Amino acid sequence: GPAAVTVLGLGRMGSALAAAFLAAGHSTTVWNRTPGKADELAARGARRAGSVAEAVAAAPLVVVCVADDEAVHQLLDPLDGALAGRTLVNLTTGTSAQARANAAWAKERGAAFLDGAIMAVPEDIATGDAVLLYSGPRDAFDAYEEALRVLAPAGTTHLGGDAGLAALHDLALLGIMWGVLNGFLHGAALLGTAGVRAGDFAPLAARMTTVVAGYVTAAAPEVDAGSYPAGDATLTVHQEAMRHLAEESEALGVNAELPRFLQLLAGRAVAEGHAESGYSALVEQFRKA
Amino acid sequence: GPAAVTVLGLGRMGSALAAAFLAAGHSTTVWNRTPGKADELAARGARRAGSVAEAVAAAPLVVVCVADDEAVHQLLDPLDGALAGRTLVNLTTGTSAQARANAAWAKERGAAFLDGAIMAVPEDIATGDAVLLYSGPRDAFDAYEEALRVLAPAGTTHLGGDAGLAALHDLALLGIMWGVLNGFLHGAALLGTAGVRAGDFAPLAARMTTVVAGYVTAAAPEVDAGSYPAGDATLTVHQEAMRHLAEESEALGVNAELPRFLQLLAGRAVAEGHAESGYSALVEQFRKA
Ligand SMILES: NC(=O)c1ccc[n+]([C@@H]2O[C@H](COP(=O)([O-])OP(=O)(O)OC[C@H]3O[C@@H](n4cnc5c(N)ncnc54)[C@H](OP(=O)(O)O)[C@@H]3O)[C@@H](O)[C@H]2O)c1
Ligand SMILES: NC(=O)c1ccc[n+]([C@@H]2O[C@H](COP(=O)([O-])OP(=O)(O)OC[C@H]3O[C@@H](n4cnc5c(N)ncnc54)[C@H](OP(=O)(O)O)[C@@H]3O)[C@@H](O)[C@H]2O)c1
């Protein structure tokens, strides 16, 4: 049947995690530092643990979702041997270095450790819009995927054994989001000088975004190969259009810092001999500090 | 019946335009500065004009596709009485300023003017994959829509009456492309430090991209209303994640200039008083030089 699970942390997001486990039929034990945040869950069937030690002893799967890594260790460091044989899933926001250090710490204490990144707001937990990324030993993920997937039934993803991968993928994916939104908003500013409503630009911008998803998968093998054929446009052609975008921005009185930055990066690739390479050659500029 | 059409310029793209008109059954007159580029078009029924003047006299719809605005200028400027009653469609890459000047110039010579932006490679002309954006007086677009759509049968769009709109839309849409691709390549660099192959990141990055296409249309009403509710994250929350991405880049030895620039832009918005606004508030600083 459903695995027993413990949730440590009943903030907005921890509470949503515990509610999802309970609604899916798991025996759910909950704990929070400050009393008074567990009684609705208890009334729905959760076990209100009397202490951290009881909570951690209650289930082989311990999901932690608190403010930061300092709080995680305030809760878990005083435990003496309680973690041995258990699987710790840390959904607290942290860095890749914190996750890798936590993996070593947990291994010393006999626990399996998965670091997770929640790509969702609390209200979207257990919906098809949620994504949760996991990293750490695959055997622990496989053992508990049936339980963990109730938090993101169409979005539960194991990335690999390096515990730092979740944090890094989360940030990398947000980078794509910021790139899209900046392009939309800068474009909306540019077109706004000609009276164009952002809602008139948006369907074209959204379709472009969808099209460029295919460019992403097309570029990946070139990155891995270190070989960057021009395909449909050399970096020279890209850079010229970048220059044009900057010059139109300056002429029309909107901010040109974004296209000038794009042009800077492309120019560094051209300076290293990639005038006739495809856009994927810019990966070499991103690897260099 | 299919309108007679003239194509000026038989480079890689002009040749594809002429071929498409011919295949669709239009009487097609062609001209190129250098002879010997129209043999196959002529075998297919193209009428080879001996001069620009003869070409413009042959058909009321004149499609121009040469290297740049200087070339368009050298072809058009000697024409006076020849242009009366014609509709000039300029598919040459150029600036919004040049397009607006060309519209006014043509109108004083008795000719209608549409500026166009080809978002396609030559081999995709006359396929469902092609996109062609047009701008200029709508009466001319409507008069020749049946002819023009042969070039992009599922992707022809008239943007508005301002002749400069096509150039601006093309560049704004490319800005979105560069945003996605830089986000992907920076992410690939960052994850590369952990041994992640770009092809293993790519499915996640592409899924992200297709999801964020929906964020674009969600943001448009906020831009048009000048109202920027936080939604799922205030600018403070965005900026903190941006800083995290920069710090991970720095600590892992890859380039951090992109996340630091993202941080700069978001901080520009926060300094205007938008700490608690949503991301669409960034449009305001994109409007400011
Ligand atoms: N949209 C989101 O909310 C979202 C999305 C993705 C990830 N996350 C992550 O989820 C984690 C929790 O966020 P949240 O929204 O639930 O935050 P929250 O509503 O502020 O709750 C924070 C939780 O951390 C606990 N905590 C703080 N300091 C502690 C300590 N020293 N010892 C023990 N517990 C401590 C709090 O306990 P008390 O009740 O005793 O204060 C509470 O359970 C964060 O790392 C957050 O970044 C949140
Ligand atoms: N993928 C693409 O190719 C693509 C995509 C979108 C837009 N475009 C745009 O389409 C336009 C043409 O590109 P293309 O690929 O066809 O370039 P191309 O193969 O280099 O052909 C350039 C054409 O311009 C003509 N030309 C140049 N200077 C001239 C002048 N001073 N007087 C008369 N004719 C002149 C050339 O005539 P000669 O043969 O006599 O040299 C030739 O017909 C450009 O503005 C380009 O940016 C191209």
Residue numbers in the entry:
A (entry chain A), B (entry chain B): 10 to 298
Text lifted from the article:
Since imine reductases (IREDs) were reported to catalyze the reductive amination reactions, they became particularly attractive for producing chiral amines. However, the industrial application of IREDs is mainly restricted by limited substrate scope, especially low activities towards bulky amines. Phylogenetic and bioinformatic analysis suggested the IREDs IR-G02 (Streptomyces albidoflavus), IR-21 (Saccharothrix espanaensis), and IR-35 (Allokutzneria albata) were all derived from actinomycetes and belonged to the same evolutionary branch with sequence identity ranging from 40 to 44%. IR-G02 shows an excellent substrate scope, which is applied to synthesize over 135 amine molecules as well as a range of APIs’ substructures.
Each of the monomers was made up of an N-terminal Rossman domain and a C-terminal helical bundle connected by a long inter-domain α-helix. Except for the NADPH binding site, the pocket cavity of IR-G02 showed a strong negative electrostatic surface potential, which may favor the entry of positively charged amine donors and imine intermediate, and contribute to its high substrate promiscuity. Superimposition of apo-IR-G02 and IR-G02-NADP+ complex shows an overall rmsd of 2.665 Å. There are substantial changes in the Rossman fold: most secondary structures shift with the binding of NADP+, and the side chain of T102 flips with its hydroxy group facing the NADP+ and forming a hydrogen bond with the ribose moiety of NADP+. The homologous site of the residue S260 in IR-G36 is occupied by A242 in IR-G02 and no interaction is found between the loop 234–244 and NADP+, indicating IR-G02 is “wide” type IRED which possesses relative wide catalytic cavity for bulky-substrate entry and product release. Cavity-volume calculation using CASTp30 suggested the cavity volume of IR-G02-NADP+ (Supplementary Method 3) complex is 1.9-fold of that of AspRedAm, which also rationalizes its better substrate tolerance. Protein structure analysis suggested that T102 was located at the Rossmann fold domain with its side chain approximately 2.8–3.0 Å from the 2′ and 3′-ribose hydroxyls of NADPH, which is responsible for recognizing and binding NADPH. Analysis of the IR-G02-NADP+ complex suggested the side chain of H247 is positioned approximately 11.9 Å from the NADPH C4 atom that delivers and accepts hydride, whereas the distance from W187 to NADPH C4 atom is 12.8 Å. Tunnel analysis using Caver41 suggested D241 is located at the flexible loop A234-L244 on the top of the active site, which forms a bottleneck (about 3.6 Å) imposing steric constraints for the entrance of the bulky substrates.
